[PDB]
Amino acid sequence: AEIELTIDGHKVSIEAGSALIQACEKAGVTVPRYCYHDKLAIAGNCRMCLVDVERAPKPVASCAYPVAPGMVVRTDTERVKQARENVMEMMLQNHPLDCPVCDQGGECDLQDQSMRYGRDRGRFTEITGKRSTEDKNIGPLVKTSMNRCIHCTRCVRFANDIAGAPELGSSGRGNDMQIGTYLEKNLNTELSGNVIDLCPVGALTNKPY
Amino acid sequence: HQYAKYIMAALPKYIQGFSVWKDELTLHVAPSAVIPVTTFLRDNTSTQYKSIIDITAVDYPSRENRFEVV
Amino acid sequence: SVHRNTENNNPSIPFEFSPENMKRAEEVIAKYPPQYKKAAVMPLLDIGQRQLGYTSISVMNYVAKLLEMPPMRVYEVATFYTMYNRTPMGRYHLQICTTTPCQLCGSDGIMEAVQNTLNIKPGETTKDNLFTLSEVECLGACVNAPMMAINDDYYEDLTPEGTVKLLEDCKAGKMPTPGPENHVR
Amino acid sequence: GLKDQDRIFQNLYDNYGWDLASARKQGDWYKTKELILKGDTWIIDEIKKSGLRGRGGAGFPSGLKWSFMNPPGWEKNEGPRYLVVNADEGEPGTCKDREIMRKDPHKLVEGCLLAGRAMNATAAYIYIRGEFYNEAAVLQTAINEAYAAGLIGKDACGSGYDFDVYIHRGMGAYVCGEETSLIESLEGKAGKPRLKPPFPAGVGLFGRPSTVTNVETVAVAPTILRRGGDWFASFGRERNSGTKLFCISGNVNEPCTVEEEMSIPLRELLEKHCGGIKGGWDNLLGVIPGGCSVPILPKNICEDVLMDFDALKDVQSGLGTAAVIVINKQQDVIRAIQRFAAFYKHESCGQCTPCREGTTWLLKAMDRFRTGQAKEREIDMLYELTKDIEGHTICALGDAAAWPIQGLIRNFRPEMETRMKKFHDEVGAVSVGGWMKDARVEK
Amino acid sequence: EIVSGAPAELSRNRVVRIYQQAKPATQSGEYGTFAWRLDWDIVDVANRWENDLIGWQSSGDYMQATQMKFTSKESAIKFANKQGWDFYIQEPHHRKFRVKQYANNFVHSYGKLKH
Ligand SMILES: Cc1cc2nc3c(=O)[nH]c(=O)nc-3n(C[C@H](O)[C@H](O)[C@H](O)COP(=O)(O)O)c2cc1C
Numbered sequence A: 001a002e003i004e005l006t007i008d009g010h011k012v013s014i015e016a017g018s019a020l021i022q023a024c025e026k027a028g029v030t031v032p033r034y035c036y037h038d039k040l041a042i043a044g045n046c047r048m049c050l051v052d053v054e055r056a057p058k059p060v061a062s063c064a065y066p067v068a069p070g071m072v073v074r075t076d077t078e079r080v081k082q083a084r085e086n087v088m089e090m091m092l093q094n095h096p097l098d099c100p101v102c103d104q105g106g107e108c109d110l111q112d113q114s115m116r117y118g119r120d121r122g123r124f125t126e127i128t129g130k131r132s133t134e135d136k137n138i139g140p141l142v143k144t145s146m147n148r149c150i151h152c153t154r155c156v157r158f159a160n161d162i163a164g165a166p167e168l169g170s171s172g173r174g175n176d177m178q179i180g181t182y183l184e185k186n187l188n189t190e191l192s193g194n195v196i197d198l199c200p201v202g203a204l205t206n207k208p209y
Numbered sequence B: 001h002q003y004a005k006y007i008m009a010a011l012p013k014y015i016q017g018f019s020v021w022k023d024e025l026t027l028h029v030a031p032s033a034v035i036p037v038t039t040f041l042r043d044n045t046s047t048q049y050k051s052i053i054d055i056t057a058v059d060y061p062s063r064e065n066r067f068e069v070v
Numbered sequence C: 001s002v003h004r005n006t007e008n009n010n011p012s013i014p015f016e017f018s019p020e021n022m023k024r025a026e027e028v029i030a031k032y033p034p035q036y037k038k039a040a041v042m043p044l045l046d047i048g049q050r051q052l053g054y055t056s057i058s059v060m061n062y063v064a065k066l067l068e069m070p071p072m073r074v075y076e077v078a079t080f081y082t083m084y085n086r087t088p089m090g091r092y093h094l095q096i097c098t099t100t101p102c103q104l105c106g107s108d109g110i111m112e113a114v115q116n117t118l119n120i121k122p123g124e125t126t127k128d129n130l131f132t133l134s135e136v137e138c139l140g141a142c143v144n145a146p147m148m149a150i151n152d153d154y155y156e157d158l159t160p161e162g163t164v165k166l167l168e169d170c171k172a173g174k175m176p177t178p179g180p181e182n183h184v185r
Numbered sequence D: 001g002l003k004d005q006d007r008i009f010q011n012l013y014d015n016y017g018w019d020l021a022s023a024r025k026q027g028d029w030y031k032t033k034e035l036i037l038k039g040d041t042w043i044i045d046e047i048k049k050s051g052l053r054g055r056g057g058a059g060f061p062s063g064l065k066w067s068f069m070n071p072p073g074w075e076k077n078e079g080p081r082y083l084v085v086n087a088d089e090g091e092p093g094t095c096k097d098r099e100i101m102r103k104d105p106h107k108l109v110e111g112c113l114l115a116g117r118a119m120n121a122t123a124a125y126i127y128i129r130g131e132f133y134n135e136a137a138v139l140q141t142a143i144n145e146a147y148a149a150g151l152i153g154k155d156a157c158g159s160g161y162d163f164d165v166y167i168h169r170g171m172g173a174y175v176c177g178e179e180t181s182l183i184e185s186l187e188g189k190a191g192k193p194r195l196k197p198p199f200p201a202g203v204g205l206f207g208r209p210s211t212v213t214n215v216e217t218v219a220v221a222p223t224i225l226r227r228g229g230d231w232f233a234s235f236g237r238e239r240n241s242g243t244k245l246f247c248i249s250g251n252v253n254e255p256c257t258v259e260e261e262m263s264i265p266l267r268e269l270l271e272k273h274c275g276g277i278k279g280g281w282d283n284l285l286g287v288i289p290g291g292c293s294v295p296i297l298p299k300n301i302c303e304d305v306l307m308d309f310d311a312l313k314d315v316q317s318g319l320g321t322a323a324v325i326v327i328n329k330q331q332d333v334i335r336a337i338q339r340f341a342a343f344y345k346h347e348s349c350g351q352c353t354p355c356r357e358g359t360t361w362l363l364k365a366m367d368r369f370r371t372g373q374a375k376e377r378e379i380d381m382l383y384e385l386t387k388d389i390e391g392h393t394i395c396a397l398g399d400a401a402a403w404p405i406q407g408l409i410r411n412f413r414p415e416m417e418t419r420m421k422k423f424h425d426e427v428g429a430v431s432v433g434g435w436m437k438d439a440r441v442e443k
Numbered sequence E: 001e002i003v004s005g006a007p008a009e010l011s012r013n014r015v016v017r018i019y020q021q022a023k024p025a026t027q028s029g030e031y032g033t034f035a036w037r038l039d040w041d042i043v044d045v046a047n048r049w050e051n052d053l054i055g056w057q058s059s060g061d062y063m064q065a066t067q068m069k070f071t072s073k074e075s076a077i078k079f080a081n082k083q084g085w086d087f088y089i090q091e092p093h094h095r096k097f098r099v100k101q102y103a104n105n106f107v108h109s110y111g112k113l114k115h
């Protein structure tokens, strides 16, 4: 019911079959994450919590690679860091420029954990356009700008698993994933307004605030 | 480092642990005995300093002793 | 640009299915375990598609009610699949493969021949509503790469001459054809 | 012992075998009682001696995956276990159903039966691509033939297994050609994969553990359990084995399809069986071997390499589909790879954050490389951003998108620079008044 | 105890707060977990009124915005009794272990299904 694993000298015993992020956070090692959450089910979507594990060719996603007994785990291999910069670049070069007027100024968790893991030249030209995203109405209680949604899918898992109003489904492929509904119907559920403290970017936000 | 090891071995009663950082040096001294330390180390042959540039203080109100004096 | 658009343009939840379709649907559902029962949703949407072309929000809501599902999961299924055509579509959906072997044997000129025949931009439909264009990617059948498919089936090895003859014929006269010759060698 | 024209006493025969009865004349449904009533462990040992390598794209030894479906805890009441047939083929190049599913399904039915005997599978699902509505009815009636004649279903040639065959339609998603997105499609959800380390052999595939097999690696199963393990091990390499199917297309002399020896010269393959190159051997510019997702061999190191897996893996090319596309020298490789970029744009699912923005950025770059708007350093910038997607996805679709451009920087760049020579002032002086100005990419 | 260098009558009058800074729920990231905070309350009549000319908020608390950043709660409280004013400590609240099989995507006979 306990297992030692070694994350970078920090040996730590946690419960069997658990989450590797839970081992990292028990070991006091800060691991950047966007689509992990505590009280939601794990999705592998955000692809940020990559960590190097012995006897594995690729840096696996620490949100979902289960605890194997006696692992050697590195968060500081240059493959890890100079892949995290890679993944953050490939999360940001389709994000809009709303940073002064996006609501989560000092709380865009993307923006907060960008500088210490990121890369300056998001490569573009005046020829290149990113993509646009249709704003959608979820209710007069929640202001919504879906241009900023980095598809963390924390909202969907929250509306399904904890809320029980499954009306915020995902849609589309490629660039064209939109979250919400394309029936354009308003969510009117209880504890809906938790989601604006939950989408880590300011795509969902508070309407009277 | 080696200079700090010399100062450590030369006056082991009155000194505490040295601390080296990025081309400068900081000697930790027990506070009841500073005057015999600074009769030395200002005024040794091998340590001919003779010129002081700052005495001041820093609080960190964390610990039970409160004001380190630098 | 696979879009996820509104539901205003006279598709506002008013439709159903028909008589043999429900029996055939029960036959389909019987291929799946009784509890944990959703997996007939994609062929049931095909049955709705062949019943009512341009599968609207209404038949999707009817399926979601029918298979005990919350609706957004059904929308989340039918948001993927390019089979599930949403906008009203003509009698013969014309799917030109423009993938790499089809490119390298001249389907580019085939699309040129079609747009010369039917002056339609390749994401639109004819004003006659006889044909609806769609460039499509590889249907696997790289056998005779200038092929296309039309609404059910594949027409191998098309010259632009054979293509415009097919566009003349499929106005009225059906062409149950793999290709002009028989075999694959 | 060189490799040959595969010696017509072979596995499959499309021409005179589409029948219940003519399949039995071919040698199908011929020793089925002995096979089912022999142990599944015997099937494990025979297919492991066979050295059968998985034709899906992994190149995986099939006996290891099939034994990997069998743990010791299997005999505990963990629920009805079954099997999934990846009958979708969605890569460019693979015509490996029109030969197989359209023209020889009665191999495939008892192939599923023998494989499910090896799994102790309660039933089996066959996941056809629902684009093949022509083929789907043909296969479904062919299954219903043996299903109504008692050959399959609850007494399948005197079987102690009740075993059912259900057909299911793949609705226009190459991503559903990946196994785990296939499982989530068979859960009736969206075609979005799951993350790997809960392995599909025990996680619950549609709730209970299963496996996913290629249609061609299960089509050979009853023939290779009626023949010996040394029959398939007689060919190819010491580790690669047997015959595999080739779909040869692109700008060639005669576009065609065969089923031939592994480890053959590609030049003999083109010249002896498909006419040759349209323009001859001195008129190719590159060859796309195997998958759509494989780097391109150049004209000199396509001459004498092999047509295996492992040696071509040493020439950076994992021929996981064995579908060869050959190009004239008078055509644009740039347009081909740009079309693959648009292909992955239509076929990226959406779960992976890097895959979507990756494929979009790659498409935006390859349009510049067609039109010649780039700068000389942007080639290596493109290579770096392809390396960004090289190992950082859930499923290997992103890696599959990363292979052709990594093949583009390899063996090439006279022609990137030659197209980029065709004007000056890259990233040109424009204004963007209400839309952009002075140039544009595709719309 | 007499205060040596505290000219106010803070030491008899106000309630101060020792608290672990809460884990923010909006961002993920936990740097506020690793401090200890001293904060004077606003239980006041002064308590930040409204100005009438421009309309700032001119306070009357001479020590409205002030935070120590300590290391340990007992070092915090030994300081708090050493300089000697009335405190109240507040215990933090952790997040409890819950085993997360990423494979939680499997059922028996059961009505409800999820994404
Ligand atoms: C993105 C991706 C797409 C794939 N598409 C197909 C396909 O369309 N047809 C196929 O037979 N295998 C496809 N495969 C390979 C499957 O995983 C295949 O079922 C697997 O290799 C089974 O191994 P096998 O050949 O031993 O059966 C794909 C794999 C990946 C990663």
Ligand code: SF4
Pocket (backbone or CB within 6 Å): A095, A096, A097, A098, A099, A100, A102, A103, A104, A105, A107, A108, A109, A110, A111, A148, A200, A201, A202, A203
């Ligand atoms: S979420 Fe908003 S505030 Fe944060 S980086 Fe993105 S645009 Fe800026």
Ligand code: SF4
Pocket (backbone or CB within 6 Å): A148, A149, A150, A151, A152, A153, A154, A155, A156, A179, A198, A199, A200, A201, A203, A204
């Ligand atoms: S709604 Fe918000 S939390 Fe959910 S995926 Fe979109 S941006 Fe993320």
Ligand code: SF4
Pocket (backbone or CB within 6 Å): D175, D193, D347, D348, D349, D350, D351, D352, D353, D355, D356, D393, D394, D395, D396, D397, D398, D399
């Ligand atoms: S590689 Fe990732 S984004 Fe692409 S289809 Fe697979 S899971 Fe989706």
Ligand code: FES
Pocket (backbone or CB within 6 Å): A033, A034, A035, A036, A037, A043, A044, A045, A046, A047, A048, A049, A050, A061, A062, A063, A064
């Ligand atoms: S949550 Fe761990 S990678 Fe997305």
Ligand code: FES
Pocket (backbone or CB within 6 Å): C097, C098, C099, C100, C101, C102, C137, C138, C139, C140, C141, C142, C143, C145, D092, D093, D094
């Ligand atoms: S080549 Fe386009 S369909 Fe196979």
